[PDB]
Subunit: 134 residues, 4 copies
């Protein structure tokens, strides 16, 4: 896993353009997600069990994404994928074995461009409240 980031302003620049198709993933607990999240973000359960099954490779990230979608999600390895939790500043500040870290590895294998959101939902919701759904 390489691990790269995108900042809020640049994500919004990305969303506002008909340039790229974005897969937005919210890796927080569902109460948080259901409470508020970035528009059209897909909730991927931050479970300790799900982490085990992903690293056991008994679940595929592409499988989890689609099962987690209320919509019928488009899986396409050309989609720019942005992941976020509550307040992680960068990939380096993560522990080697946590869920988000595991999630990024699986994603970087199935998608060409995978980025963590700098500051997480905390910063994003702080800057663009009109872009969050409750």
């Amino acid at each position: 896993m390489i691990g790269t980031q995108i900042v809020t302003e640049r994500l919004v620049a990305l969303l506002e353009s008909g340039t790229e198709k974005v897969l937005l993933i919210d890796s927080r607990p569902f109460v948080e997600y259901n409470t508020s999240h970035i528009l059209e973000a897909i909730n991927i359960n931050c479970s300790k069990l799900m982490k085990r099954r992903l690293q056991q490779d008994k679940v595929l990230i592409t499988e989890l994404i689609q099962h987690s979608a209320k919509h019928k999600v488009d899986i396409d390895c050309s989609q720019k994928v942005v992941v976020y939790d509550q307040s992680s500043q960068d990939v380096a500040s993560l522990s080697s074995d946590c869920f988000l870290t595991v999630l990024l590895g699986k994603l970087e294998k199935s998608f060409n461009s995978v980025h963590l959101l700098a500051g997480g939902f905390a910063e994003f919701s702080r800057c663009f409240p009109g872009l969050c759904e409750g």
Copy 2:
């Protein structure tokens, strides 16, 4: 689905010099596969029942690829993927609603480089019988 081909000879070249990881997909009936197939190739049942599940996006291709593997098949979008049937010369000569075309469409979505083997397992086993497996 765009549809590109690789000729039998460039496949071997692609294999011999391990500069790229190759995912080899045998899309023929199980009996044809189990008889003889290109070394290390993965069999994806030519089931019209599996077809209908793919077009329904009720099963993902990478899911279907890992299910059809004895070893731990590494789903990685930067893998070069080569599909083969019995004796298809190229992608244009395929019907609009056949398993292969359905298979290639879903594969090109999950994988960067996806190629049909020009001539199928007919010409390959006709040229490199030592690279086949009983």
Copy 3:
């Protein structure tokens, strides 16, 4: 250089439905190009002198592509690239040290998807004479 092909028919399909940007490269002598070439195709002189400059990496392919364009050719690595000569059936039938093979090698380095047109400008102009340009 791996070496993959696209058949005349899938090229047109690739063009008609603008879901991908296509870079069309005519690798024949200038007189052959100027007579008739596939619509919008860029001519890259088959010069043994240009060959030697490419293998010396004294001229870059994207440099050579923009030099050989009347319009502003957008060098973009995510462009689908299709090369053609007069009547080459596939990449395997090419000599190890010919311009085409040298051209494809450098192109695959600068571009994600690079394909030889199966049958060259012979079969294409034999099938879509309306998509040729005098």
Copy 4:
């Protein structure tokens, strides 16, 4: 231009792995570069003139990279490219028309993975002094 970042720790993780080939680009003035820079970083002159020629598309970024290399540089669109200046924190904190911003656009077009180093040479040299050359 999308614009993404990589932090020092993750760049070093990237360099230390035989996983990916990295193109390291130093976009500062040459006195700074010659004074000290990250090992094997290629100096790309931060010139106001060069900025104009790049945006006029009269110079190609792939052309500039190779001309700027004391070594014979490998241009290959699969190379992970990390760019850095003195102390830019993220892409969003850049002005829309500055050189670095122009540089990132051109690079993102010729390379699949292009990232700005979070904090620039200032932070990198602050953390890994043994990885800088004077």
